[PDB]
Design an enzyme around this catalytic site. Structure first.
Site, PDB file in Angstrom:
ATOM      1  N   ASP A 102      22.215 -76.313  78.508  1.00 50.53           N
ATOM      2  CA  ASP A 102      21.601 -76.527  77.196  1.00 50.53           C
ATOM      3  C   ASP A 102      22.314 -75.861  76.023  1.00 50.53           C
ATOM      4  OD1 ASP A 102      19.665 -76.785  75.122  1.00 50.53           O
ATOM      5  OD2 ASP A 102      17.999 -75.974  76.308  1.00 50.53           O
ATOM      6  N   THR A 103      23.141 -76.637  75.310  1.00 50.55           N
ATOM      7  CA  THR A 103      23.906 -76.132  74.153  1.00 50.55           C
ATOM      8  C   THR A 103      22.989 -75.741  72.988  1.00 50.55           C
ATOM      9  OG1 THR A 103      24.452 -78.350  73.365  1.00 50.55           O
ATOM     10  CG2 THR A 103      26.065 -77.339  74.832  1.00 50.55           C
ATOM     11  N   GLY A 104      21.770 -76.284  72.945  1.00 51.30           N
ATOM     12  CA  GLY A 104      20.847 -75.909  71.874  1.00 51.30           C
ATOM     13  C   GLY A 104      20.158 -74.567  72.091  1.00 51.30           C
TER      14      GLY A 104
HETATM   15  O1  CN4 Z   1      14.525 -83.284  76.500  1.00 50.02           O
HETATM   16  C1  CN4 Z   1      13.393 -82.805  76.465  1.00 50.02           C
HETATM   17  C2  CN4 Z   1      12.608 -82.524  77.734  1.00 50.02           C
HETATM   18  C3  CN4 Z   1      13.382 -81.502  78.587  1.00 50.02           C
HETATM   19  C4  CN4 Z   1      12.948 -81.500  80.047  1.00 50.02           C
HETATM   20  C5  CN4 Z   1      13.897 -81.477  81.065  1.00 50.02           C
HETATM   21  C6  CN4 Z   1      13.518 -81.378  82.394  1.00 50.02           C
HETATM   22  C7  CN4 Z   1      12.178 -81.313  82.684  1.00 50.02           C
HETATM   23  F1  CN4 Z   1      11.794 -81.256  83.988  1.00 50.02           F
HETATM   24  C8  CN4 Z   1      11.205 -81.331  81.717  1.00 50.02           C
HETATM   25  C9  CN4 Z   1      11.600 -81.430  80.393  1.00 50.02           C
HETATM   26  C10 CN4 Z   1      13.319 -80.084  78.036  1.00 50.02           C
HETATM   27  C11 CN4 Z   1      12.105 -79.476  77.718  1.00 50.02           C
HETATM   28  C12 CN4 Z   1      12.051 -78.143  77.340  1.00 50.02           C
HETATM   29  C13 CN4 Z   1      13.223 -77.440  77.276  1.00 50.02           C
HETATM   30  F2  CN4 Z   1      13.179 -76.135  76.896  1.00 50.02           F
HETATM   31  C14 CN4 Z   1      14.440 -77.994  77.566  1.00 50.02           C
HETATM   32  C15 CN4 Z   1      14.481 -79.327  77.943  1.00 50.02           C
HETATM   33  N1  CN4 Z   1      12.733 -82.549  75.317  1.00 50.02           N
HETATM   34  C16 CN4 Z   1      13.212 -82.920  74.029  1.00 50.02           C
HETATM   35  C17 CN4 Z   1      13.324 -84.277  73.709  1.00 50.02           C
HETATM   36  C18 CN4 Z   1      13.816 -84.646  72.466  1.00 50.02           C
HETATM   37  C19 CN4 Z   1      14.201 -83.685  71.545  1.00 50.02           C
HETATM   38  C20 CN4 Z   1      14.087 -82.359  71.893  1.00 50.02           C
HETATM   39  F3  CN4 Z   1      14.492 -81.418  71.007  1.00 50.02           F
HETATM   40  C21 CN4 Z   1      13.602 -81.915  73.109  1.00 50.02           C
HETATM   41  C22 CN4 Z   1      13.525 -80.436  73.437  1.00 50.02           C
HETATM   42  C23 CN4 Z   1      14.889 -79.852  73.820  1.00 50.02           C
HETATM   43  C24 CN4 Z   1      14.830 -78.344  74.067  1.00 50.02           C
HETATM   44  C25 CN4 Z   1      16.061 -77.817  74.804  1.00 50.02           C
HETATM   45  N2  CN4 Z   1      17.207 -77.602  73.869  1.00 50.02           N
HETATM   46  C26 CN4 Z   1      16.874 -76.834  72.534  1.00 50.02           C
HETATM   47  C27 CN4 Z   1      16.708 -75.307  72.825  1.00 50.02           C
HETATM   48  C28 CN4 Z   1      15.427 -74.575  72.437  1.00 50.02           C
HETATM   49  C29 CN4 Z   1      14.199 -74.962  73.242  1.00 50.02           C
HETATM   50  S1  CN4 Z   1      13.430 -76.433  72.740  1.00 50.02           S
HETATM   51  O2  CN4 Z   1      12.430 -76.748  73.709  1.00 50.02           O
HETATM   52  O3  CN4 Z   1      13.123 -76.285  71.357  1.00 50.02           O
HETATM   53  N3  CN4 Z   1      14.640 -77.511  72.843  1.00 50.02           N
HETATM   54  C30 CN4 Z   1      15.722 -77.568  71.830  1.00 50.02           C
HETATM   55  O1  CN4 Z   2      16.384 -69.743  69.413  1.00 55.30           O
HETATM   56  C1  CN4 Z   2      15.166 -69.894  69.409  1.00 55.30           C
HETATM   57  C2  CN4 Z   2      14.383 -70.032  68.118  1.00 55.30           C
HETATM   58  C3  CN4 Z   2      15.150 -70.943  67.143  1.00 55.30           C
HETATM   59  C4  CN4 Z   2      14.462 -71.127  65.793  1.00 55.30           C
HETATM   60  C5  CN4 Z   2      15.154 -71.751  64.758  1.00 55.30           C
HETATM   61  C6  CN4 Z   2      14.549 -71.996  63.532  1.00 55.30           C
HETATM   62  C7  CN4 Z   2      13.241 -71.600  63.361  1.00 55.30           C
HETATM   63  F1  CN4 Z   2      12.637 -71.846  62.158  1.00 55.30           F
HETATM   64  C8  CN4 Z   2      12.517 -70.970  64.348  1.00 55.30           C
HETATM   65  C9  CN4 Z   2      13.142 -70.733  65.568  1.00 55.30           C
HETATM   66  C10 CN4 Z   2      15.539 -72.289  67.753  1.00 55.30           C
HETATM   67  C11 CN4 Z   2      14.575 -73.218  68.153  1.00 55.30           C
HETATM   68  C12 CN4 Z   2      14.941 -74.441  68.696  1.00 55.30           C
HETATM   69  C13 CN4 Z   2      16.290 -74.719  68.826  1.00 55.30           C
HETATM   70  F2  CN4 Z   2      16.662 -75.907  69.369  1.00 55.30           F
HETATM   71  C14 CN4 Z   2      17.271 -73.838  68.446  1.00 55.30           C
HETATM   72  C15 CN4 Z   2      16.886 -72.616  67.911  1.00 55.30           C
HETATM   73  N1  CN4 Z   2      14.410 -69.905  70.531  1.00 55.30           N
HETATM   74  C16 CN4 Z   2      14.932 -69.865  71.848  1.00 55.30           C
HETATM   75  C17 CN4 Z   2      14.813 -70.997  72.648  1.00 55.30           C
HETATM   76  C18 CN4 Z   2      15.385 -71.014  73.910  1.00 55.30           C
HETATM   77  C19 CN4 Z   2      16.074 -69.907  74.382  1.00 55.30           C
HETATM   78  C20 CN4 Z   2      16.147 -68.792  73.583  1.00 55.30           C
HETATM   79  F3  CN4 Z   2      16.736 -67.683  74.083  1.00 55.30           F
HETATM   80  C21 CN4 Z   2      15.600 -68.706  72.313  1.00 55.30           C
HETATM   81  C22 CN4 Z   2      15.629 -67.417  71.513  1.00 55.30           C
HETATM   82  C23 CN4 Z   2      17.025 -67.016  71.028  1.00 55.30           C
HETATM   83  C24 CN4 Z   2      16.944 -65.754  70.169  1.00 55.30           C
HETATM   84  C25 CN4 Z   2      18.309 -65.118  69.916  1.00 55.30           C
HETATM   85  N2  CN4 Z   2      19.031 -65.806  68.799  1.00 55.30           N
HETATM   86  C26 CN4 Z   2      18.187 -66.067  67.493  1.00 55.30           C
HETATM   87  C27 CN4 Z   2      17.910 -64.723  66.708  1.00 55.30           C
HETATM   88  C28 CN4 Z   2      16.494 -64.309  66.292  1.00 55.30           C
HETATM   89  C29 CN4 Z   2      15.583 -63.882  67.432  1.00 55.30           C
HETATM   90  S1  CN4 Z   2      14.920 -65.131  68.438  1.00 55.30           S
HETATM   91  O2  CN4 Z   2      14.423 -64.530  69.636  1.00 55.30           O
HETATM   92  O3  CN4 Z   2      14.056 -65.963  67.662  1.00 55.30           O
HETATM   93  N3  CN4 Z   2      16.260 -65.952  68.857  1.00 55.30           N
HETATM   94  C30 CN4 Z   2      16.930 -66.849  67.886  1.00 55.30           C
END
Ligand code: CN4
Ligand code: CN4
Ligand code: CL
Ligand code: CL
Ligand code: CL
Ligand code: CL
Lengths: 99, 99
Positions: free
Chosen positions: B25-27
């Site tokens: 997961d690059t995000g």
């Molecule tokens: O692609 C999935 C579902 C996926 C999954 C795969 C295997 C499983 F059996 C169950 C579900 C998933 C769910 C949660 C997760 F943390 C990672 C992947 N959601 C999605 C769909 C469209 C857009 C979108 F931004 C997301 C969400 C991506 C996550 C992971 N990359 C970033 C990293 C910060 C965490 S997050 O949840 O905000 N997010 C953005």
């Molecule tokens: O990185 C985020 C929060 C972040 C965001 C962005 C804009 C906002 F208005 C609010 C939240 C975000 C959300 C979705 C996404 F796809 C990418 C990024 N969560 C996360 C999700 C998955 C794994 C993970 F280790 C983290 C935590 C990373 C830490 C460290 N590096 C940063 C530094 C501040 C501390 S922290 O604990 O929030 N955190 C972010």
């Protein structure tokens, strides 16, 4: 280009004639962007994230440029913390993971 | 290897003596693994994303084996719906995005 992952892989995208910053996310099935106006009809969709599920609006065949690469595809609009370019569009721009 | 993104980039990982499936997961800035026991000290943390926040236990200097590559780093343990390999460990195996 080759993008390393020491920092967030943020790119400029162009959608609806406006420039926005978005994250290239291999962990996202689809693309989701913050609230904005998009043309046409939308369909309902639920997407799951780390915190749970959210409702989004799904728009189809939307023109979007990603780091200058032209794409046309599904764009979800909703309460996302960041604009995310998911696999549906990363495949369109020929993006792969390499190690 | 070169991993295409038509489907979720799932890999097998070895952590704390256990084999688990995880998503590249690059995000994600850091690695998040479902509830499991890990050795050493930990600190509580809240992390957010799509759907809101989850409470996790932050463990430092954890060794993980991803596709035969040993990497060491921070591992967040909590109720994530999928194990995710974040940038903190993807950089260690020399993982890049290419297009
Ligand atoms: O692609 C999935 C579902 C996926 C999954 C795969 C295997 C499983 F059996 C169950 C579900 C998933 C769910 C949660 C997760 F943390 C990672 C992947 N959601 C999605 C769909 C469209 C857009 C979108 F931004 C997301 C969400 C991506 C996550 C992971 N990359 C970033 C990293 C910060 C965490 S997050 O949840 O905000 N997010 C953005
Ligand atoms: O990185 C985020 C929060 C972040 C965001 C962005 C804009 C906002 F208005 C609010 C939240 C975000 C959300 C979705 C996404 F796809 C990418 C990024 N969560 C996360 C999700 C998955 C794994 C993970 F280790 C983290 C935590 C990373 C830490 C460290 N590096 C940063 C530094 C501040 C501390 S922290 O604990 O929030 N955190 C972010
Ligand atoms: Cl860019
Ligand atoms: Cl699409
Ligand atoms: Cl780390
Ligand atoms: Cl490097």
């Amino acid at each position: 280009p080759q993008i390393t992952l020491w920092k967030r892989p943020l790119v400029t995208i162009k959608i609806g004639g406006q420039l926005k910053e978005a994250l290239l996310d291999t962990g996202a099935d689809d693309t989701v962007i913050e609230e904005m106006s998009l043309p046409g009809r939308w369909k309902p969709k639920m997407i799951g994230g780390i915190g749970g599920f959210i409702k989004v609006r799904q728009y189809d065949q939307i023109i979007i440029e990603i780091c200058g690469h032209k794409a046309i595809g599904t764009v979800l609009v909703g309460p996302t913390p960041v604009n995310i370019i998911g696999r549906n569009l990363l495949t369109q721009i020929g993006c792969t993971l390499n190690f």
